[PDB]
Amino acid sequence: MTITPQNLIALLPLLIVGLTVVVVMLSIAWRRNHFLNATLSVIGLNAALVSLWFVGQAGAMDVTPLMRVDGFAMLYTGLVLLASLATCTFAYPWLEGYNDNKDEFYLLVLIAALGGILLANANHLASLFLGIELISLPLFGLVGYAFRQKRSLEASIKYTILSAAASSFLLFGMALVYAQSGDLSFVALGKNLGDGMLNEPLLLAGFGLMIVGLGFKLSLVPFHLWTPDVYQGAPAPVSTFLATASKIAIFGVVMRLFLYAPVGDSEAIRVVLAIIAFASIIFGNLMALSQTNIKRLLGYSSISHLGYLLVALIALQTGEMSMEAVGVYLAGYLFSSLGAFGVVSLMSSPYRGPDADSLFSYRGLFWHRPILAAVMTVMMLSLAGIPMTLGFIGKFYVLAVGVQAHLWWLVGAVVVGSAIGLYYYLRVAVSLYLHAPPSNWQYSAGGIVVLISALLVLVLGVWPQPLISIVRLAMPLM
Amino acid sequence: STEVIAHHWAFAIFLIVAIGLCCLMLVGGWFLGGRARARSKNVPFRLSAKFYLVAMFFVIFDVEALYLFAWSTSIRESGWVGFVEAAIFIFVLLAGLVYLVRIGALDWTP
Amino acid sequence: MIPLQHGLILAAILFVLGLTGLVIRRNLLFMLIGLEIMINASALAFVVAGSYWGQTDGQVMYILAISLAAAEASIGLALLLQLHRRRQNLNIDSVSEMRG
Amino acid sequence: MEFAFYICGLIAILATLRVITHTNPVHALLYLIISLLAISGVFFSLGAYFAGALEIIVYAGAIMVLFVFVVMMLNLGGSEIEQERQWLKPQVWIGPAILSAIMLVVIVYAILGVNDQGIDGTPISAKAVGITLFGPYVLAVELASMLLLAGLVVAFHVGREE
Amino acid sequence: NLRRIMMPQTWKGHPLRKDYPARATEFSPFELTKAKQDLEMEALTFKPEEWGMKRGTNEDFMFLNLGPNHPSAHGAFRIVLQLDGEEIVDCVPDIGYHHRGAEKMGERQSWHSYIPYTDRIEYLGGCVNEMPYVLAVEKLAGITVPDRVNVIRVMLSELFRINSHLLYISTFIQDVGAMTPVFFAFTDRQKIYDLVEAITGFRMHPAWFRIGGVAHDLPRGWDRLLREFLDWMPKRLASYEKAALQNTILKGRSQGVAAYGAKEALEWGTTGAGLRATGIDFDVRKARPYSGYENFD
Amino acid sequence: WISPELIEILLTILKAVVILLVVVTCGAFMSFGERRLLGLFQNRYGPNRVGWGGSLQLVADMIKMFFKEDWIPKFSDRVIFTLAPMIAFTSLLLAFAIVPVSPGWVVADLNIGILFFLMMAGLAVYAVLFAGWSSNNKYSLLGAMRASAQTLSYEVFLGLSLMGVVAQAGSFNMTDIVNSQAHVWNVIPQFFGFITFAIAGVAVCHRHPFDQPEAEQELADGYHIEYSGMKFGLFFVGEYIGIVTISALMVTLFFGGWQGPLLPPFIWFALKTAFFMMMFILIRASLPRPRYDQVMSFGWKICLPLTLINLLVTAAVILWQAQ
Ligand SMILES: CCCCCCCCCCCCCCCCCC(=O)OC[C@H](COP(=O)(O)OCCN)OC(=O)CCCCCCCCCCCCCCCCC
Ligand SMILES: CCCCCCCCCCCCCCCCCC(=O)OC[C@H](COP(=O)(O)OCCN)OC(=O)CCCCCCCCCCCCCCCCC
Ligand SMILES: CCCCCCCCCCCCCCCCCC(=O)OC[C@H](COP(=O)(O)OCCN)OC(=O)CCCCCCCCCCCCCCCCC
Ligand SMILES: CCCCCCCCCCCCCCCCCC(=O)OC[C@H](COP(=O)(O)OCCN)OC(=O)CCCCCCCCCCCCCCCCC
Ligand SMILES: CCCCCCCCCCCCCCCCCCCC
Ligand SMILES: CCCCCCCCCCCCCCCCCCCC
Ligand SMILES: CCCCCCCCCCCCCC
After folding, report:
1. What range defines the domain where residue D91 resides?
2. How far apart are CA F310 and CA F304, in angstroms?
């Protein structure tokens, strides 16, 4: 299919982020200016976020065989852009202490955001593969941005090797699926079968290898072991981006693939994903019980929260509000992770060497940084699914979706993992208030971002109806 | 068609005879001529990162070159739309090249 | 008159050989070499599938695959050079200080 | 046409097996180059002419040139890890070999149950690939330019000398 | 770092002392074998400290030795370079590989029989090399040469100066990369050699100047050969200029390369064209005129 | 065994063998002609005593290099050391395998064509790298690394310089490229493509002024310095065969191939190819050698953008006249 002017209007955040990449790179070629290039990057990301309004006015349409733009794509584009803007905001005071080149960071963040937007709009195996790669490779650079530090270099090496392995797994699975199906469009994956022959062995094997790649990308058990090391070793704004934008974009494209593919309602794939979700919830909660590192603990937490999201994924064809539950949960998880990782980033700013990630460094945070401690305890309550937080609204959505589809093993897993999470999240939040032995407007902007995240988490925990109505508006093509 | 199979046979014989020809000259060079020994006959008569940078730039720009190779053989039936797409591709290419030159990535001399 | 199963089997054999080389080799260069083998095998599988269906999409996916392979090889070799600079040793077991 | 396919596939398999077990890195890269040439021959036997041309031009002419370049720069000689031959010890490779054999058996069993009319080997030209690339796959082309730009920026940031 | 510069480091004695024997000692294959072994393990046991080098092997610099591999008629010598990648951070030249003991031979030959040795001090110079020696001997003897001797010696000196300059310019062009003008410049050198062979009987080392004059009178017909060379030369020189010295690749290879000013030239004893390129007008033929050079425009 | 198809099969095989033998002998006798033409350019004679006009000088060199003692360094890696001259010969020989020298006289009428030439060029840079590393000489290794980086800096735009001709022809096939030059030769519209292809073809053949073993002789860092006998002869003859192949490719891509008004088509092809071979000699005789960084900066900063702009302008012109 060709590209029309209305298709170009539906292309608007992708085009704006690409133009921002080109403009920022040419500005770096002109002169290395940290403030100017950071400002140009955040201006481009804000312009894409604003142009989402024109995208919504355009309507839902297919842009080439590769992409389909609807309310679903708009919501995930907005989430990716919000995470990228927060990542740049946290990146500037951290990069102020960086002695080497700082301007390439925003270029890499912009290209990764471009990959996130592509994954939001992806309707095709080609676009899914390209969006995953377009997220991953800038993250190879960003995780090892402070490559003189041994932890950042080790995290970069681990992430690069394992993501290349997962990409080869995903591409081999895509090739097997294409060999069975003869079409790489999402709606055709299983369409050429009938009379109860959906469980074609090559199609299932291809989807299993794609599950290997995607479950690496979503930190799902047993493709999860990279998560605490890469989360700890990466720079703290990079950890923010990797926790929010990459996970949200990859889960959104997984949502769309399982909604559109006729093989998505196969019972074998459903049982395999149920096993993966159960193991992810239980394992991610259990491994975070005895973590003295806040970044590793947040990595195991991310494993458990993606397990809850996968539980919502399993009831996609059974129930009616699986996509709405996923949208509400992902908005709440984005805000909670933005606040927690942003407090970590502000505590590690400016960059001086090793990250401030020990729990002893956050012991007694209230006595010198009271606002940051209040934000961090709000986020620990939100990630525990405590009421008057948006995390509880997401957990309630997950539980309702599981109860409707009679996924009782998954519901019990969510309850048990919630209790374990209660233990370690409360441990962090109350260690904030114990007793233990900046000065520029960009650091204040980062503090304002984490404060706004805390206020949004509390307000939408008490009053979740605006977020619920927004997510219900953002519906894909049936 | 017998013309294409004749050309396939001719191509196979060309490759085989060329490889066998260089093998035969190497064998004749090894076999012929006397050999002598000397005491110091056996005696033979850290590179910077710019080497890797140049090879890496070559690899990346060769992949973009393959994209333009695919475009250039089908320009007429891709129309002006394909021209606009390839112009965007080439502009991103030239912006990357300008960025590489301006930051000293392609400056061997200090 | 080439069965699609035979091309897919050849691609799978190359893929598992590359995965074996990725697992059993401590040296980071041989890990990257195994990664190149696996991504080349997946690209071959896409080419076989595209040739079976008479479509250009297999070769287009091959093109995207080798673009990924080139960029990933570039990044992995840069990281290998950094590891050799800061460690004088390419043993991947040495980069293990983050655990638990 | 199938003669070339089976012999090139066998050569690629054997060369890859020599790659993953070899000690000398330059020799291993040479066997990898041989396997890529054989894979290009496989591509040409299937009618994917552009894929085979790019297999030698880009994979066996750029990427492995970069690998060879890095190996020659590092001056890899009598390395301690190289001298040990730990991967040749049965207790090291017997586990991963069984794991890969199990994965191969499962994938082959899935492969053998698919519908197969055979590949006719009708040549899909580079012109048709170029038409498809700048038609339905335009966004793939532009975002692949962005992907390789990201690889360029990352590799320059990491692989600098300073 | 006060080390030997002419003799090898494992040399016994000081040859210019009056009790050191001038003549060659008996050759021995054993010492040749030993010095070959020192050459073979010179790189293996190289330490920067004995050469005056420092801060090497930082562990980023390399030490690289140059040898007798580019013989552009200058001779054999070594340079050890300390390199940061491609950049020279320090280098010392290793010389004395062309040491002939010429001053010691000056104590070994008569005043007359030393003139051929003066010829081989700077072997592209010939009678130019002969001139200061015979002038200094004539100062010792109290000899004032007549005007014809002065003009003949000036003419021979200028012919050999043109010969040496032709070799220098052509070899510079060859070193830059243009391999053609050396053939033509050596043809011009052959025209000079036609005149020099006719006058002195020899090509490169004429040994023709004498204490008190020159060895013979000018042969009849010298002016014809001089006129032929003076007609031949200017078109060839203009052709070399246009073909090579005005090429922008040669200019980009040579302009701004190894630049120094007047102070650096003065502090290192640089003379000739290297000194005068810094703007210092110091030529001996004008500042301290000799051999009747003051009568020439 | 009497059938027209079988007779045509041996006719095509015999034509391919004739093309191969003529190309190899033309490369060797062009080493000899390089000596003679440098003599012509430098007001001298060159070799004119061994045979009539020096015509047996090549045979004397071949006998001398055959009966020179075969030497492999003991600390060298034998397989790679032996393999590098084989690639330096065969890469540009098989690149010639696509060149149509006359209507009906072609070895392989491939659908890829200059793509096959690009494949062969990549294998040629492998020959240089292998020769440098296998000699177990760190100077040869450094010189081969510099030569290979130069070769990559020009191979990065070699194919892009050919893409304007490909775009005008609308095909990768070499005979279609010739037939598209039936009215106007490609040197007029693809002039910048012609000059960039000529520069890149000289550079990938390691000819002056891109010859690394002659560029830096004081460092003694040439990657040929451990080769001797028939392996050095393989390097020499492969370099001259590469010059012949690059000249023939330039003739068939920018100068109409075999097309001409009066003479037979092979006569026109041979005359144009011999003219470009002679221009290779004159380039060697006349131009000085730029610095290494200057050469690579010229390749990256000037020639590659020129090829990209030339391709874009060629496409705009082609679509403009496509009414
Ligand atoms: C310093 C500079 C600062 C600049 C400002 C930065 C912050 C503010 C950013 C504002 C972004 C605005 C985006 C607006 C998107 C919706 C636009 C719109 O009009 O949507 C309406 C459309 C359905 O309505 P209608 O127009 O009738 O549809 C016709 C098409 N069939 O609706 C749709 O089709 C779908 C509607 C929902 C799509 C998702 C919403 C956008 C992304 C939100 C991400 C965050 C969500 C979670 C937080 C919510 C908090 C309340
Ligand atoms: C020391 C030895 C190392 C190894 C050297 C090589 C080993 C093998 C030698 C024997 C080769 C036998 C002949 C191969 C087949 C030739 C014919 C052929 O390829 O035909 C297929 C195809 C036809 O295309 P076309 O004419 O357009 O037809 C359209 C529809 N019929 O045409 C094509 O598909 C053309 C494209 C493929 C051409 C491949 C040519 C060889 C490539 C490898 C070069 C190796 C160089 C030396 C080693 C490098 C370093 C290892
Ligand atoms: C001889 C016994 C074995 C000896 C040791 C191994 C030597 C090398 C063996 C592999 C290479 C040669 C394989 C045989 C090719 C013979 C030609 C052939 O099969 O042609 C058929 C077909 C022609 O094309 P098409 O138009 O489709 O015709 C179909 C029939 N009308 O052809 C095609 O479609 C494709 C033609 C082949 C592809 C091009 C050549 C690829 C060469 C890859 C070499 C890899 C490295 C080898 C290293 C060897 C040493 C380890
Ligand atoms: C059959 C094969 C031959 C076919 C004939 C046509 C093609 C010839 C191919 C020859 C290739 C040689 C390439 C040489 C490139 C040199 C570029 C370079 O680095 O030049 C450096 C020089 C100065 O650079 P800069 O940085 O300014 O230095 C200042 C520092 N002091 O910068 C300069 O001097 C600027 C100009 C550089 C050279 C421009 C290109 C000249 C190409 C050669 C002349 C060809 C003329 C036509 C021949 C007849 C054709 C029928
Ligand atoms: C210094 C630490 C080195 C760690 C090496 C890790 C190697 C792992 C090898 C795993 C082998 C698995 C063998 C098959 C297991 C059973 C089948 C799969 C599970 C059902
Ligand atoms: C440098 C030139 C290399 C050429 C290699 C191939 C030579 C092939 C010779 C073919 C001769 C016959 C051509 C067809 C007939 C037309 C010409 C007749 C008179 C020769
Ligand atoms: C660790 C979590 C344990 C949860 C146990 C849930 C058991 C559900 C059993 C459902 C049986 C349904 C029979 C029809």
Report:
1. 1-159
2. 10
